[PDB]
Amino acid sequence: GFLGAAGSTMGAASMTLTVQARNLLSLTVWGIKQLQARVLAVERYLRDQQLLGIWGCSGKLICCTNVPWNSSWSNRNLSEIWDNMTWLQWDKEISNYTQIIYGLLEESQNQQEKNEQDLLAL
Amino acid sequence: GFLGAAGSTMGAASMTLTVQARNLLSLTVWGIKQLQARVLAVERYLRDQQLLGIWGCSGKLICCTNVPWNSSWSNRNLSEIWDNMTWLQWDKEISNYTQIIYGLLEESQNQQEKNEQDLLAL
Amino acid sequence: GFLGAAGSTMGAASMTLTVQARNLLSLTVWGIKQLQARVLAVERYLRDQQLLGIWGCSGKLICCTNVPWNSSWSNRNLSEIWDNMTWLQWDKEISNYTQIIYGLLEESQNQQEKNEQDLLAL
Amino acid sequence: AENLWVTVYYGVPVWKDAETTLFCASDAKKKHNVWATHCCVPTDPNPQEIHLENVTEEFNMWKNNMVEQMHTDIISLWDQSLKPCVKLTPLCVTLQCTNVTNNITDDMRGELKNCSFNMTTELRDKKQKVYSLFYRLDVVQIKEYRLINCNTSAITQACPKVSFEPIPIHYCAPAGFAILKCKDKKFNGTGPCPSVSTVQCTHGIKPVVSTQLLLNGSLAEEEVMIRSENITNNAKNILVQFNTPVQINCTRPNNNTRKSIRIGPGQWFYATGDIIGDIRQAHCNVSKATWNETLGKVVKQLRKHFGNNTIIRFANSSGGDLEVTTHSFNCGGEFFYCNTSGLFNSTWSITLPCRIKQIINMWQRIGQAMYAPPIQGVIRCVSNITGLILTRDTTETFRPGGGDMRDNWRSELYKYKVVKIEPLGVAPTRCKR
Amino acid sequence: NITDDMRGELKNCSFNMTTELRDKKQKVYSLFYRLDVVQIK
Numbered sequence: 117g118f119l120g121a122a123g124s125t126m127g128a129a130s131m132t133l134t135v136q137a138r139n140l141l142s143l144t145v146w147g148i149k150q151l152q153a154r155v156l157a158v159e160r161y162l163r164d165q166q167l168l169g170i171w172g173c174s175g176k177l178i179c180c181t182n183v184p185w186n187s188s189w190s191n192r193n194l195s196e197i198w199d200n201m202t203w204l205q206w207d208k209e210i211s212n213y214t215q216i217i218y219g220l221l222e223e224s225q226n227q228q229e230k231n232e233q234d235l236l237a238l
Numbered sequence: 239g240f241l242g243a244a245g246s247t248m249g250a251a252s253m254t255l256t257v258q259a260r261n262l263l264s265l266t267v268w269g270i271k272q273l274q275a276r277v278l279a280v281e282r283y284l285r286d287q288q289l290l291g292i293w294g295c296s297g298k299l300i301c302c303t304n305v306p307w308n309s310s311w312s313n314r315n316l317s318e319i320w321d322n323m324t325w326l327q328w329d330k331e332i333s334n335y336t337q338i339i340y341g342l343l344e345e346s347q348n349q350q351e352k353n354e355q356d357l358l359a360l
Numbered sequence: 361g362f363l364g365a366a367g368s369t370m371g372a373a374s375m376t377l378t379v380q381a382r383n384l385l386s387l388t389v390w391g392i393k394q395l396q397a398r399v400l401a402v403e404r405y406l407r408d409q410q411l412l413g414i415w416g417c418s419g420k421l422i423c424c425t426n427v428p429w430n431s432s433w434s435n436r437n438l439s440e441i442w443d444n445m446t447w448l449q450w451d452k453e454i455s456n457y458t459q460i461i462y463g464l465l466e467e468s469q470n471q472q473e474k475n476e477q478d479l480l481a482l
Numbered sequence: 483a484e485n486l487w488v489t490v491y492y493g494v495p496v497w498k499d500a501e502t503t504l505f506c507a508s509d510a511k512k513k514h515n516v517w518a519t520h521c522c523v524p525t526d527p528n529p530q531e532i533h534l535e536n537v538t539e540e541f542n543m544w545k546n547n548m549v550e551q552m553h554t555d556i557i558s559l560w561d562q563s564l565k566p567c568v569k570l571t572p573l574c575v576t577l578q579c580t581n582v583t584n585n586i587t588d589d590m591r592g593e594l595k596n597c598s599f600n601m602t603t604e605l606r607d608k609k610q611k612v613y614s615l616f617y618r619l620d621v622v623q624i625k626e627y628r629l630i631n632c633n634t635s636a637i638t639q640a641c642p643k644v645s646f647e648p649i650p651i652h653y654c655a656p657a658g659f660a661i662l663k664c665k666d667k668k669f670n671g672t673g674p675c676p677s678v679s680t681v682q683c684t685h686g687i688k689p690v691v692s693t694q695l696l697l698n699g700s701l702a703e704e705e706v707m708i709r710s711e712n713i714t715n716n717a718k719n720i721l722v723q724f725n726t727p728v729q730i731n732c733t734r735p736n737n738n739t740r741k742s743i744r745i746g747p748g749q750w751f752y753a754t755g756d757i758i759g760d761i762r763q764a765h766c767n768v769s770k771a772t773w774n775e776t777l778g779k780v781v782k783q784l785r786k787h788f789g790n791n792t793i794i795r796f797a798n799s800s801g802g803d804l805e806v807t808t809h810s811f812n813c814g815g816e817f818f819y820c821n822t823s824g825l826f827n828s829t830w831s832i833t834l835p836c837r838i839k840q841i842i843n844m845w846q847r848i849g850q851a852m853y854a855p856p857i858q859g860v861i862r863c864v865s866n867i868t869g870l871i872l873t874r875d876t877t878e879t880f881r882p883g884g885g886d887m888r889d890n891w892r893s894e895l896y897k898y899k900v901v902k903i904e905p906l907g908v909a910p911t912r913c914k915r
Numbered sequence: 916n917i918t919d920d921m922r923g924e925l926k927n928c929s930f931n932m933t934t935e936l937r938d939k940k941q942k943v944y945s946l947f948y949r950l951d952v953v954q955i956k
């Protein structure tokens with residue numbers, strides 16, 4: 117059922133997230149090629165986990181932020197986005213808005229951690 | 239002291255969990271064999287961490303759930319389990335009850351995250 | 361800007377932690393040497409993450425403890441440490457105090473988790 | 483604007499086109515068969531399928547890197563199987579040959595050479611006379627002759643205990659990747675298709691290598707399909723996939739003998755000779771009525787592409803080397819070159835004479851040659867012609883072509899595509915820390 | 916065809932080498948620089 121949700125709308129698909137998130141980990145020339153494939157799978161996995169860590173979303177399939185949507189990214193109604201789009205269609209719709217969002221998420225989490233230390237410091 | 243707790247009862251052994259959890263990470267044919275061993279150790283480590291993440295137990299050696307014990311798994315008294323059994327004996331006692339529990343834990347965590355988003359959405 | 365903060369004081373440098381923490385992950389003889397380099401980078405990354413997990417600092421760039429500073433480690437004023445030292449100078453100042461601190465952090469987290477289970481058990 | 487915040491979702495079911503390494507997988511079931519000794523972890527008999535209800539994905543078989551991988555993997559496996567076992571450098575000697583005429587039909591009169599020569603077993607300067615029959619195509623005149631490849635390449639003996647008999651191989655995705663496929667009938671092999679489903683492992687494909695005719699593999703769902711990269715461009719091959727097989731029966735009706743010659747300290751050379759009984763020409767029979775009906779179906783479909791008001795014909799290919807001009811296959815362990823002029827002769831049983839070679843320059847390279855040891859007894863095999871590789875030169879003319887090994891896999895891998903899973907993204911919503 | 920400072924630098928060196936294991940050697944000659952060739956004419 118790995119891509120079973122691919123044709124589902126975003127608000128319907130985001131219930132199967134466990135499956136898609138889970139099935140990522142599953143002596144001459146072929147030996148080295150197989151290792152390269154295994155090392156790569158691990159590296160890709162860790163990069164995604166590190167970003168969730170940085171953004172303050174570690175341990176969650178869905179996480180809230182404190183960074184607002186900036187409109188120019190997309191001006192669609194949220195009911196249009198969640199009910200009339202699949203995640204694949206959506207990714208295409210905003211395929212050009214990547215680090216423009218990620219950098220903001222990183223900045224936000226760093227400020228939040230500083231604020232928390234300043235309060236625990238009191 | 240890595241397996242020092244192996245002969246201890248479950249309620250006694252679960253104080254050394256740090257040691258057992260910690261000591262998991264520690265150019266021809268031997269070169270490739272050694273890499274295969276290292277890659278495997280990493281892959282095994284990550285699978286366990288991913289499950290703890292999925293079940294909502296990330297970052298903990300011991301974590302509570304919201305899934306009840308279902309009796310048929312074992313009908314022993316909890317005082318019998320924690321004081322008259324070692325973890326090895328226990329694992330053998332319920333060796334046939336694995337994904338029967340894990341799937342429930344996965345379902346529970348997903349429902350909990352949805353509920354949390356719906357509340358933060360308010 | 362990876363080591364841009366190297367000449368900054370500790371209280372100034374600890375704002376760029378995201379960058380230093382983030383840029384850690386970035387068919388014959390060279391094939392095997394390159395894999396060894398990649399496997400090693402992953403192993404080093406995971407060891408640091410495991411310690412943060414063990415100490416109860418997972419997911420944070422900065423984390424508070426419940427273990428006091430023990431004086432013999434350093435008798436400098438905190439204003440001297442945070443404003444008149446860089447992290448590199450500081451690391452040299454206390455380069456001989458490593459597991460002497462880490463073991464305490466491990467013990468503390470284990471006690472805290474036991475206490476939490478005993479309360480959730482109620 | 484609505485005060486919606488950026489919410490991050492992990493486990494998002496999306497993907498991008500990608501190129502990675504796919505792994506070999508097989509059945510649980512051949513002891514010295516290179517495809518079986520390649521381990522090829524057994525597949526799970528249960529397909530995932532996971533029909534994707536609203537997915538309309540874009541394919542391009544002419545750019546399918548899965549074909550490129552299969553080509554590379556086949557060559558690599560082939561080459562490594564030749565590292566052990568006997569090298570035949572010592573055969574590059576002067577041969578003294580006669581015409582082998584004591585038990586022949588006349589059509590075979592010029593095909594065999596007797597070829598006596600001096601070779602040793604010890605570094606004793608003690609050579610012995612050895613004779614072996616050779617096929618004419620492997621021997622070139624300098625009465626004195628030499629083997630054809632001793633002028634340009636090393637000759638390696640195929641190791642007699644190793645089989646290359648095709649076993650269907652499934653390709654499986656590595657973690658983080660998935661294979662998508664079209665289920666549509668009457669699909670171009672290119673462009674978008676609905677009814678896309680997922681694949682962990684592809685159906686098994688036998689790595690059959692041939693020229694001109696496509697053998698075994700699989701059949702089209704309803705009607706013969708004609709696929710091409712550039713149909714109006716006469717520089718391209720046209721791949722025609724039949725919707726029903728044409729049965730072809732081939733044989734080498736000669737009871738032969740394998741002669742073991744000591745060539746070195748633990749090394750053996752396999753010579754051939756002393757054929758028992760009449761010497762006859764190798765051939766294929768092709769059922770005639772089926773072939774004619776099959777062309778009629780092909781012609782109808784060619785007309786849909788080229789006009790239903792024209793006339794086309796089939797010609798007996800073109801000039802060039804046997805690797806190009808004849809049909810090629812190796813059933814039974816020996817390499818056959820057959821004359822398809824008996825098939826591609828029309829305007830809109832068939833016995834095809836065949837020749838056999840022992841010294842093979844595998845298509846993929848030069849500088850090396852393989853020597854196929856003789857097979858003891860006789861050879862018979864039956865196969866399914868499942869398609870054609872055609873080129874085109876009012877009326878129009880078609881000819882058998884191909885010769886590029888990749889066309890034999892491209893014709894099967896037109897349904898599968900490899901994508902990378904990228905399960906992370908964002909969307910605006912109601913979700914505030 | 917030499918200048919005198921090059922007079923001792925080159926050797927003509929004829930030898931027997933083959934192309935087939937035919938015990939059929941052919942004469943080949945090559946010039947060599949003196950530094951690559953050592954006396955056992």
Ligand SMILES: *[C@@H]1O[C@H](CO)[C@@H](O[C@@H]2O[C@H](CO)[C@@H](O[C@@H]3O[C@H](CO)[C@@H](O)[C@H](O)[C@@H]3O)[C@H](O)[C@H]2NC(C)=O)[C@H](O)[C@H]1NC(C)=O
Nearest residue numbers: 647648690692697698811812813814815862863864865866
């Ligand atoms: C297309 O598929 C057919 C069927 O799989 C292939 O022909 C088959 O080839 C094998 C290998 O030569 C034959 O079996 C052999 O029989 C001899 C008998 O002594 C045995 O010694 C071998 O170990 C092996 O068992 C098999 O009978 C044969 N099938 C038929 C019907 O004759 C065919 O070769 C495939 N096409 C191509 C181009 O490979």
Ligand SMILES: *[C@@H]1O[C@H](CO)[C@@H](O[C@@H]2O[C@H](CO)[C@@H](O)[C@H](O)[C@H]2NC(C)=O)[C@H](O)[C@H]1NC(C)=O
Nearest residue numbers: 580581582583584596597598613615755756757
């Ligand atoms: C190939 O040539 C050899 C050499 O003449 C033939 O073998 C000879 O056959 C005669 C028949 O009695 C024997 O007496 C000789 O001793 C054989 N020679 C050797 C070396 O054994 C051989 O039959 C020819 N092969 C053909 C025509 O198939």
Ligand SMILES: *[C@@H]1O[C@H](CO)[C@@H](O[C@@H]2O[C@H](CO)[C@@H](O)[C@H](O)[C@H]2NC(C)=O)[C@H](O)[C@H]1NC(C)=O
Nearest residue numbers: 578579580581582590591592593594595596625
């Ligand atoms: C083997 O048979 C071929 C023919 O099948 C012989 O070829 C003949 O060679 C002579 C040489 O002058 C030509 O004049 C003939 O016309 C050739 N025949 C044909 C049909 O072209 C060949 O010489 C035979 N070899 C031996 C060793 O007898």
Ligand SMILES: *[C@@H]1O[C@H](CO)[C@@H](O[C@@H]2O[C@H](CO)[C@@H](O)[C@H](O)[C@H]2NC(C)=O)[C@H](O)[C@H]1NC(C)=O
Nearest residue numbers: 575576577578597598599600601609610611612
């Ligand atoms: C195997 O070696 C023998 C010995 O050298 C070859 O026989 C010689 O052939 C030359 C050719 O003119 C004759 O002059 C010699 O007198 C032959 N020697 C003897 C002892 O007969 C023989 O021909 C070689 N075998 C082959 C097939 O070339």
Ligand SMILES: *[C@@H]1O[C@H](CO)[C@@H](O[C@@H]2O[C@H](CO)[C@@H](O)[C@H](O)[C@H]2NC(C)=O)[C@H](O)[C@H]1NC(C)=O
Nearest residue numbers: 582583584585586587755756757758759760761
């Ligand atoms: C060529 O083939 C024929 C037919 O098989 C062989 O002739 C037979 O040989 C056996 C051997 O003892 C005889 O008993 C038969 O009577 C022969 N048949 C006839 C019709 O006489 C012939 O020997 C083969 N020739 C060679 C050189 O092997």
Ligand SMILES: *[C@@H]1O[C@H](CO)[C@@H](O[C@@H]2O[C@H](CO)[C@@H](O)[C@H](O)[C@H]2NC(C)=O)[C@H](O)[C@H]1NC(C)=O
Nearest residue numbers: 728729730731732767768769770831832863864
């Ligand atoms: C290939 O050989 C097979 C037999 O090995 C042929 O099969 C026979 O075909 C006739 C056609 O009517 C049937 O009646 C026979 O019963 C078939 N034999 C068997 C054993 O089933 C087959 O037709 C041959 N193909 C060609 C193209 O000749």
Ligand SMILES: *[C@@H]1O[C@H](CO)[C@@H](O[C@@H]2O[C@H](CO)[C@@H](O)[C@H](O)[C@H]2NC(C)=O)[C@H](O)[C@H]1NC(C)=O
Nearest residue numbers: 697698699700701726727728729864865866867
């Ligand atoms: C040639 O095509 C025929 C069908 O026209 C193939 O027949 C299959 O044989 C297997 C053997 O058990 C059966 O399970 C299949 O159901 C048969 N197919 C059909 C449509 O009945 C035959 O195997 C083909 N030969 C080759 C070499 O592929």
Ligand SMILES: *[C@@H]1O[C@H](CO)[C@@H](O[C@@H]2O[C@H](CO)[C@@H](O)[C@H](O)[C@H]2NC(C)=O)[C@H](O)[C@H]1NC(C)=O
Nearest residue numbers: 919920921922923924925926927928949954956
């Ligand atoms: C090649 O030239 C060198 C000198 O350039 C020759 O060397 C002479 O060898 C004889 C041998 O008795 C000596 O007496 C001479 O004194 C050598 N000359 C010098 C300058 O040392 C050498 O012999 C020449 N080789 C040939 C083949 O002629």
Ligand SMILES: *[C@@H]1O[C@H](CO)[C@@H](O[C@@H]2O[C@H](CO)[C@@H](O)[C@H](O)[C@H]2NC(C)=O)[C@H](O)[C@H]1NC(C)=O
Nearest residue numbers: 928929930931932938939940941942943944956
């Ligand atoms: C190449 O091989 C030939 C044949 O052996 C050599 O010529 C012989 O040289 C010896 C040396 O004393 C003479 O006794 C023989 O009579 C020569 N034979 C002939 C046929 O002339 C020749 O010198 C070799 N080439 C080189 C450069 O050593």
Ligand SMILES: *[C@@H]1O[C@H](CO)[C@@H](O)[C@H](O)[C@H]1NC(C)=O
Nearest residue numbers: 121122123124125128535536
């Ligand atoms: C596919 O699109 C149709 C269009 O109405 C929709 O009803 C159907 O539910 C979609 N498939 C999925 C998986 O949502």
Ligand SMILES: *[C@@H]1O[C@H](CO)[C@@H](O)[C@H](O)[C@H]1NC(C)=O
Nearest residue numbers: 242243244245246247250324
């Ligand atoms: C071993 O079993 C005996 C049985 O009474 C028990 O007293 C002892 O404590 C056990 N060992 C450990 C490590 O608990």
Ligand SMILES: *[C@@H]1O[C@H](CO)[C@@H](O)[C@H](O)[C@H]1NC(C)=O
Nearest residue numbers: 364365366367368369372446
């Ligand atoms: C370098 O040292 C001088 C000494 O006063 C200080 O002012 C300056 O800010 C230091 N550099 C950094 C990066 O802090």
Ligand SMILES: *[C@@H]1O[C@H](CO)[C@@H](O)[C@H](O)[C@H]1NC(C)=O
Nearest residue numbers: 622623624630632633634635
């Ligand atoms: C010998 O090899 C060369 C390599 O170019 C080839 O052209 C030549 O035709 C070969 N000899 C014969 C007789 O074919």
Ligand SMILES: *[C@@H]1O[C@H](CO)[C@@H](O)[C@H](O)[C@H]1NC(C)=O
Nearest residue numbers: 670671672673674710713714
């Ligand atoms: C199928 O091939 C024909 C050849 O002319 C081409 O025109 C057509 O667009 C192709 N269809 C698709 C879906 O690519």
Ligand SMILES: *[C@@H]1O[C@H](CO)[C@@H](O)[C@H](O)[C@H]1NC(C)=O
Nearest residue numbers: 710711712713714715716718
């Ligand atoms: C075949 O290639 C030529 C090259 O210019 C192109 O113009 C033509 O349209 C192609 N045919 C098809 C059906 O795409």
Ligand SMILES: *[C@@H]1O[C@H](CO)[C@@H](O)[C@H](O)[C@H]1NC(C)=O
Nearest residue numbers: 731732733765766767831833
């Ligand atoms: C071809 O048909 C003829 C008819 O008699 C038969 O004798 C011959 O053996 C057949 N060849 C093959 C390969 O079936």
